[PDB]
Nucleic acid binder design. Structure first.
Ligand SMILES: [K+]
Ligand SMILES: [K+]
Ligand SMILES: [K+]
Ligand SMILES: [K+]
Ligand SMILES: [K+]
Ligand SMILES: [K+]
Ligand SMILES: [K+]
Ligand SMILES: [Mg+2]
Ligand SMILES: [Mg+2]
Ligand SMILES: [Mg+2]
Ligand SMILES: [Mg+2]
Ligand SMILES: [Mg+2]
Lengths: 130, 177, 111, 243, 191, 205
RNA sequence: CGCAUGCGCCCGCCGUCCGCUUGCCGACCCGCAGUAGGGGCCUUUGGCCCCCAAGGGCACGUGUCGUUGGCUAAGUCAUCG
RNA sequence: GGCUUGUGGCAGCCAAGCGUUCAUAGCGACGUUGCUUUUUGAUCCUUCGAUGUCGGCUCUUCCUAUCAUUGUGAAGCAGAA
RNA sequence: AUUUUUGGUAAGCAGAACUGGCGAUGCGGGAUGAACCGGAAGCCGGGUUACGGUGCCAAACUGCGCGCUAACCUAGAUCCCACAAAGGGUGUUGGUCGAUUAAGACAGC
């Protein structure tokens, strides 16, 4: 049980606030409510656990490591690629793409979806009749 | 970076007179939401402990003190005295925070929650940065672990913002630690 | 697939008429409170600021060969934090419109 | 201030309101609990008060002063001719209680029973159940009746038969309009109850098929009417002084 | 003060099978089957297998639990220990009849599942007690005026003994002087 | 609570494991705003404080009655659906025409009667016990409380709900088989349309 | 559940007209249980994967509530038995 | 009727003592904290173009600070009381 | 009515000092109210606040945060205000002063 724990080197997703969608690394624990988080594109700072969603990724680092050491560990663990490839990570990217689609792109996607639905319906009906 | 409570060094003295051409200069480290309130408390303490009033006093300097390294966690010890419904008492507390400002805010909140003591009923006697081995409270000592590991027992379920909030959901939330 | 019979294009969103701007003991019917579907924040209200609105309802008699009547209005400013908006109509909305739907159009457009 | 002296209140509040009953025939408000491990049996019956007399009997009651001694006791006579069964009613259990599902009537109904469905039987054309009876003549009709009985067996939870009295046998009564009532069938499965009810269509059930000697029973009915009454007689309050 | 982690572990004998799923503990041994529903406890139960040796450990822990919450870990462990003891050895309670003048007449019904007490303090009333599931009551032959209750569930055996004891309370008398009754005198294991 | 703001003919809500008061407040606001609500499985509503406290509160409510004429109210309903209805009425100006219409726009049922057994049922996150009540704290089922205070239809509801759940399980198994067939058909059709799959790829989850 | 009126009444189809509506505009969507867990694949006692809101899916969704004529495999929707 | 509660009534706290020895089975001096408005006082807010002024009889309901009755704990409770 | 203050056990009792208020005055808040809080006013549009509030009634978050409480007595819930005391609790939560302890702290063997 308890597949995920908060640990030094644990990668978490910011699930609330202005920093939503960002990956951070827990480098220390202040207390039961907040922890020290870091990442390549921010300044190491405290955050409440209520705004973090623990992921399945963990990197091997000591507490409060240097920026270069943290970056090297993250690159070695390939956190970015693993998160992007995972279905959970791909969800946010797909939502962003769907939001970013424009009118003509949406029309083209609608045409493609309609054609795919028609072909799938034909195939499924033939399969049922077999 | 905004702190509710700021630390000020306030320096003052008594107005020079014929008897005392250079009166003694006093300094204090005080906590207040503003420099105006810091100066007010400085004058209160000077009047109560040195017989120097604001009317016959002089304000020499006031400077803010910022944490040297707000990026790292420290253990803070606070010695204070507070007033209850039936008398005065002394109290030593410990906290863990990146800044002594956060530690003091935690101290005020905890005093309010556990003892129903309002802000104006608390006097801070001393503050210090305590090494890990010298900490006296289990609340802070239990996080002095090289390999600290625990799950998120309590997490509140909410959308990233109210933009995605909806009254109705097709399925119940799926939660697992 | 559906075989429906109705409007083929919808260029408006819906808005529930919550009531009037009011205190606990006073009411000001010159301003109406409207909840626009899909709008959940005063930040999101910024897009609809100034957009035209129509309150369509039926009358017993025929006017210009129609039982339909329309009272035009517009969004003025956000109300609260949850996306409700204040709106002004050419005439004060009747109290019987509470809980009814108005059409919030996409014009006048700013894009 | 508190009442000077204490005595129990006059009358019972459990029989409120003291109005005229909404019915003339006694209504069974609760039937006996059904035990499915017993043969199908009717739970109730209809009778007519005839009169009262007295009897003398030797009492067998060890420890009593009346043991092996004669005792005189008043008794009431109730005439109970056999009841004719004419239909079956089924109910379904629901969160709102028992709901009547369907009613199946026998092919032949007596004039005494059909009188119960009219206010002026003689002046009417006497069309009751005439089209219903024809369902027993067309092959599809008996099939529909059998299907209705099958549905009752499938879905009903409690089964009651419709039974009417042969009132005209008691010429002392000046009534030709028979009394009809629903009598619950207890014992057996639902299918057994339905079969037992159907087999008794247009048939007589004697009183001894329901009750037997030395049995304790309950009697339900409307009391004698006395019209408008004052408090002294209606509730038992004591009379005020002469002056 | 919400201690981070309060954990306790117990060893499981090789002769007992144990299953845990959603705080539902199933215990199997030579004497039979036992089941317990620990769903009311907000604890984490884990079964640790030693691959090299093959032995079993049950670990119960609480995270950020107060003293009140943490007090239940040892309770759950003791309950599991009692289940193991009941499924391997069984439980045996001994009761003794105490009377001053009127001997207590006890009659065991068929199956050793019910007991009748007839002459408690010279009373004409008959006291009926029915043993709980899996518990059997017999009249000892080696010890005078002794009842033996044997079972697999400690709770059920003890509750049957308590029912027997409470069915024979003295009333309207100084109980210090009138000591008549049926009392538990020994608790142990059948084997 | 401004309101859901959705535009629908009606909304069906599965009240299982929902806090009574919070669900009542949310639904009262919806009804006042003009939505039509059908609540099902009212017997599964949760009440904090525990069975003992809720039973004492209901006995205190039962104590209330017009001394000279008890038939003049208050009326103490025992069924869970009626309890929910009265609780909602407590948060609505039911003595005005507006409140009367809002109440009339509401339906409450025990279990899942037809046709709602085959209609999608939604939940209210803001009133869910899993989100509002900490594990370990005392709570009781509205059905249990109603049965204790004189509701005699709990067993019938349980039986009907079990039958409905068995039928729903059969339907769900059929739907799962249909979904597997659809997936296989999609795999078969994959090769037919290349460019369409290319366009859809960056959007598929 | 029975019976339901001889310038009457009732039912079904077609044309037209009026009135009420709890407020049409895609007014589309049935798993159960749990939240100190659930599910799938592979079956080493085991390993891997998914969840982390319907934030999804479905739907010619494309035409003046939608122009004139003809063909129409399969699919889908509607209406009638 | 309303405020108050001196007075009346009903409880509590400490423990010098009583209780063959033992403060607390049962009581509680010297002190001290309360509750109630079925006592009587204090006041004069409502009623003087009028609210029928004692007591009894009858009738209903309500309270508990429980006399009896149901179930219990304690005793300087052998039984009975 | 705040403060000062006399008689009275006390009183929504009776009597004095300063100021303010009601009376003569609506309006927002305190559910309700002559005096409390805010604030005083021609008839209107727009903007912003005071006191007080933002789960529904009912306009404004089931908003972002930290602790305490679990009431098997109707837990508790906002100046006037619509009351509660002395004594207690091995319920739980913080503090203060002491004693023992790896030459081995307390309970059972
Ligand atoms: K009296
Ligand atoms: K008399
Ligand atoms: K089309
Ligand atoms: K007094
Ligand atoms: K007077
Ligand atoms: K007078
Ligand atoms: K007298
Ligand atoms: Mg009396
Ligand atoms: Mg003694
Ligand atoms: Mg009492
Ligand atoms: Mg003021
Ligand atoms: Mg204005």
């Amino acid at each position: 049980p308890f597949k995920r724990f908060v640990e030094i080197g644990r990668v978490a997703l910011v699930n609330y606030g202005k920093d939503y969608g960002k990956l951070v690394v827990i480098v220390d624990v202040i207390d039961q409510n907040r922890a020290l988080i870091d990442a390549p594109d921010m300044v190491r700072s405290q955050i409440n656990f209520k705004r973090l969603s623990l992921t399945d990724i963990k990197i091997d680092i000591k507490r409060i490591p240097k920026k270069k050491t943290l970056v090297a560990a993250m690159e070695a663990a390939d956190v970015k690629n693993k998160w992007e490839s995972s279905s959970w990570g791909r969800k946010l990217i797909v939502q962003k793409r769907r939001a970013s689609l424009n009118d003509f792109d949406r029309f083209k996607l609608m045409l493609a979806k309609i054609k795919r639905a028609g072909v799938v319906r034909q195939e499924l009906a033939k399969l049922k009749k077999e | 970076v905004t702190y509710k409570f700021h630390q000020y060094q306030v320096v003052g003295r008594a107005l020079p007179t014929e008897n005392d051409e250079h009166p003694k200069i006093y300094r204090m480290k005080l906590w207040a939401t503003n420099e105006v309130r810091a100066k007010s408390k400085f004058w209160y303490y000077l009047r109560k402990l040195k017989k120097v009033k604001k009317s016959n006093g002089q304000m020499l300097a006031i400077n803010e003190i910022f944490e040297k390294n707000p990026t790292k966690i420290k253990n803070y010890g606070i010695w204070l005295r507070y007033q209850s419904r039936t008398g005065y008492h002394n109290m030593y507390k410990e906290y863990r925070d990146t800044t002594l400002n956060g530690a003091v805010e935690q101290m005020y909140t905890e005093m309010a929650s556990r003892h129903r003591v309002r802000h104006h009923c608390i006097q801070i006697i001393k503050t210090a940065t305590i090494p890990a081995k010298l900490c006296k409270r289990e609340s802070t000592k239990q996080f002095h672990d090289s390999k600290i590991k625990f799950p998120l027992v309590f997490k509140k379920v909410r959308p990233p913002s109210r933009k995605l909030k909806t009254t109705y959901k097709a399925t119940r939330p799926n939660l697992f630690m | 697939v559906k075989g429906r019979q109705g409007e083929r294009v919808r260029l408006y969103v819906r808005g529930t008429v919550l009531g009037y701007k009011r205190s606990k003991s006073n009411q000001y019917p010159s301003t109406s409170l409207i909840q626009i579907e899909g709008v959940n924040t005063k930040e999101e209200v910024d897009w609809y600021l100034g957009k035209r609105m129509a309150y369509i309802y039926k009358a017993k008699t025929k006017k210009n060969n129609s039982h339909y009547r329309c009272i035009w209005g517009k969004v003025c400013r956000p109300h609260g934090n949850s996306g409700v908006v204040r709106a002004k109509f050419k005439s004060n909305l009747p109290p019987k419109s509470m809980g009814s739907k108005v059409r919030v159009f996409m014009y006048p457009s700013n894009i | 201030s508190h009442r000077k002296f204490e005595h129990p209140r006059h009358g019972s509040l459990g029989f409120l309101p003291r109005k005229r009953a909404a019915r003339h025939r006694g209504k069974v408000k609760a039937f006996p609990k059904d035990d499915p491990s017993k043969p199908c049996k009717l739970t109730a019956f209809l009778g007519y008060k005839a009169g009262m007399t007295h009897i003398v009997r030797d009492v067998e009651k060890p420890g009593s002063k009346l043991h092996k001694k004669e005792t005189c006791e008043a008794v009431t006579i109730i005439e109970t001719p056999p009841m004719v069964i004419v239909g079956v009613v089924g109910y379904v259990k629901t969160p709102r209680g028992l709901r009547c599902l369907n009613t199946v009537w026998a092919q032949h109904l007596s004039e005494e029973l059909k009188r119960r469905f009219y206010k002026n039987w003689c002046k009417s054309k006497k069309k009751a159940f005439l089209k219903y009876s024809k369902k027993y003549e067309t092959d599809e009709g008996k099939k529909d009746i059998q299907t209705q009985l099958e549905k009752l067996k499938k879905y009903a939870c409690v089964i009651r038969v419709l039974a009417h009295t042969q009132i005209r046998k008691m010429k002392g009564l000046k009534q030709k309009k028979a009394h009809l009532m629903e009598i619950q069938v207890n014992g057996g499965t639902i299918a057994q109850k339905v079969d037992f009810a159907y087999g008794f269509f247009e048939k007589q059930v004697p009183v001894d098929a329901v009750f037997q000697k030395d049995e304790m029973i309950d009697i339900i009915g409307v009391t004698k009417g006395k019209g408008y009454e004052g408090v002294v007689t209606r509730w038992g309050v004591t009379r005020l002084p002469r002056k | 003060m919400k201690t981070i982690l309060s954990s306790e572990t117990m060893d499981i004998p090789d002769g007992v099978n144990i299953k845990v799923k959603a705080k539902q503990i199933e215990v199997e041994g030579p004497r039979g089957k036992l089941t317990r529903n620990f769903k009311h406890l907000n604890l984490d139960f884990q079964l640790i297998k030693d691959e090299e040796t093959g032995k079993k450990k049950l670990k119960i822990d609480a995270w950020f639990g107060s003293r009140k919450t943490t007090a239940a870990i040892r309770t759950a462990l003791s309950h599991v220990e009692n289940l193991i003891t009941g499924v391997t050895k069984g439980y045996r309670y001994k009761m003794r009849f105490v009377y001053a003048h009127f001997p207590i007449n006890a009659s065991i019904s068929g199956g050793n599942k019910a007991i009748e007490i007839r002459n408690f303090l010279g009373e004409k009333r008959v006291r009926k007690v029915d043993m709980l599931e899996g518990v059997t009551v017999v009249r000892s032959e080696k010890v005078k005026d002794e009842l033996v209750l044997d079972g697999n569930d400690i709770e059920l055996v003890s509750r049957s003994a308590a029912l027997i004891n409470q069915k024979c309370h003295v009333k309207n008398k100084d109980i210090r002087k009138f000591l008549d009754g049926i009392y538990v005198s020994e608790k142990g294991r059948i084997v | 609570v401004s309101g859901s703001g959705i535009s629908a003919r009606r909304i069906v809500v599965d009240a299982r494991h929902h806090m009574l008061g919070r669900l009542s407040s949310i639904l009262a606001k919806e009804l006042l705003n003009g939505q039509k609500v059908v609540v099902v499985r009212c017997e599964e509503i949760c009440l904090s404080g525990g069975l003992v406290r809720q039973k004492m509160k209901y006995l205190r409510f039962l104590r209330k009655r017009m001394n000279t004429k008890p038939s003049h109210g208050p009326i103490h309903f025992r069924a869970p659906s009626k309890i929910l209805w009265r609780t909602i009425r407590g948060m609505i100006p039911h003595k005005t025409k507006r409140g009367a219409a809002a109440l009339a726009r509401l339906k409450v049922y025990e279990g899942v009667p037809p046709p709602y057994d085959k209609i999608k049922r939604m939940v209210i996150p803001d009133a869910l016990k899993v989100l509002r009540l900490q594990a370990g704290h005392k709570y009781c089922l509205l059905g249990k409380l109603s049965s204790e205070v004189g509701w005699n239809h709990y067993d019938t509801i349980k039986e009907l709900e079990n039958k409905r759940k068995e039928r729903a399980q059969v339907a769900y198994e059929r739907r799962k088989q249909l979904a597997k067939l659809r997936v296989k058909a999609e795999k078969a059709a994959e090769e037919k349309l290349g460019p369409q799959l290319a366009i859809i790829a960056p959007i598929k989850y």
